[PDB]
């Protein structure tokens with residue numbers, strides 16, 4: 001059978017989201033060749049490209065996403081892809097104060113970011129967001145809800161029925177977040193305050209993603225930002241993959 | 244400051260509200276529109292300083308930290324004010340009572356059409372949600388305290404970060420209280436709070452696209468010095 005996004009209970013929503021989770025990838029580098037030989041930007045690009053393929057399959061598994069037209073799915077991934085990579089990074093880097101866990105074989109500190117121009121400012125923001133989630137003791141079940149909110153919210157400001165559906169899907173994830181906070185034993189006031197602190201961090205994640213896109217658009221290379229066409233091609237080619 | 248009731252918080256915020264300014268009294272050109280927008284933003288910024296100084300918990304901060312918050316938030320604060328004023332004018336942006344501009348007028352300045360469209364979409368979203376004046380002032384105060392909070396260095400006892408977060412929790416409590424008085428169920432309360440805060444992510448995005456446009460135009464972004472001079476005066 002098929003569960004419609006709005007029929008899901010809080011526990012089914014958490015389960016579906018935990019199931020859809022992409023795997024933690026490794027940075028593609030020879031551990032026998034010296035670390036000086038590495039490109040730094042070359043490694044992050046190769047990693048982001050591989051992670052983006054998995055993000056396609058995860059998005060198609062987020063409740064309410066396939067209910068949207070192919071056109072609208074592309075718009076949401078186009079606006080959200082960097083924010084989704086960034087939230088994943090900041091979550092992985094939580095237990096590593098002063099370091100960013102890009103991959104299990106790629107844990108980079110602030111000074112390493114200084115190698116690439118304009119990268120230091122982005123690293124510092126990611127580091128601050130990571131420490132903030134650590135202070136808040138962000139839970140895995142909350143992280144998946146926040147990652148799903150980013151996807152459905154980021155490109156929502158671009159038909160009243162399709163617009164209401166995303167709002168309703170977003171209300172269902174909010175209900176799931178609150179449920180987790182009530183089970184963790186937070187009072188009603190504490191529940192609202194934690195929900196507000198988590199959603200306020202999403203504003204800073206959008207900010208980092210805009211600074212990230214600015215950096216990408218400043219690069220001399222022509223195919224450094226995933227275009228609408230490439231994202232459409234990626235979502236349509238998923239139909240040809242084996243389940 | 245944190246001793247105020249939810250109703251006292253709303254009252255102080257409503258009282259601190261800046262006035263609605265007019266655009267220079269004297270059809271529009273690409274340079275005349277940009278000129279009018281800049282002059283209006285500059286006059287509004289003076290009032291914004293006076294408004295920020297009346298937001299509870301703001302003057303409790305060091306002059307340095309106040310400047311950092313205004314430096315990160317000034318454009319999001321003009322933008323949220325604009326989108327609120329434009330609510331009752333579908334397809335138009337109410338810059339001033341004598342300056343109500345449509346989408347086609349934005350096409351005069353290059354790169355301005357994309358910003359106008361986003362502001363128009365945000366305005367219609369707040370209209371669909373039936374955003375209340377008492378909720379708008381809470382959201383505007385959240386933008387002030389929140390936008391530059393991850394900007395502050397803090398490698399000493401700078402306690403100052405916890406105070407800001409305590410003021411932000413207090414505004415959340417105020418937002419919920421307004422929703423409970425309006426008769427929303429507990430579930431409706433958390434859902435509305437989430438929808439309002441998610442729009443703040445779009446306000447940050449429009450501000451960044453606006454700063455990009457400004458930097459594409461030396462003294463077009465209010466400097467630390469100007470803001471400090473304004474806050475100290």
Ligand SMILES: C[C@@H]1Cc2c(ccc3n[nH]cc23)[C@@H](c2ccc(NC3CN(CCCF)C3)cn2)N1CC1(F)CC1
Pocket residue numbers: 044045047048049051085086088089102122211212213215216223224225226227230
């Ligand atoms: C530090 C940040 C986040 C991040 C990066 C890399 C991997 C990650 N995993 N989790 C988080 C990751 C890395 C990064 C490096 C390079 C690229 N470029 C590739 C090219 N591809 C698009 C399609 C090609 F047509 C994405 C993207 N992102 N970000 C840097 C920045 F903010 C963009 C400037």
Ligand SMILES: C[C@@H]1Cc2c(ccc3n[nH]cc23)[C@@H](c2ccc(NC3CN(CCCF)C3)cn2)N1CC1(F)CC1
Pocket residue numbers: 277280281283284285287318321322324325338358452453454456457462463464465466469
């Ligand atoms: C449409 C948008 C919002 C907005 C604008 C103008 C007035 C407003 N009132 N409410 C909202 C207003 C106008 C605008 C036009 C020009 C400027 N110029 C700045 C102000 N001044 C300070 C420097 C010395 F302190 C130079 C600022 N803002 N925004 C355009 C944009 F997104 C920034 C690019």
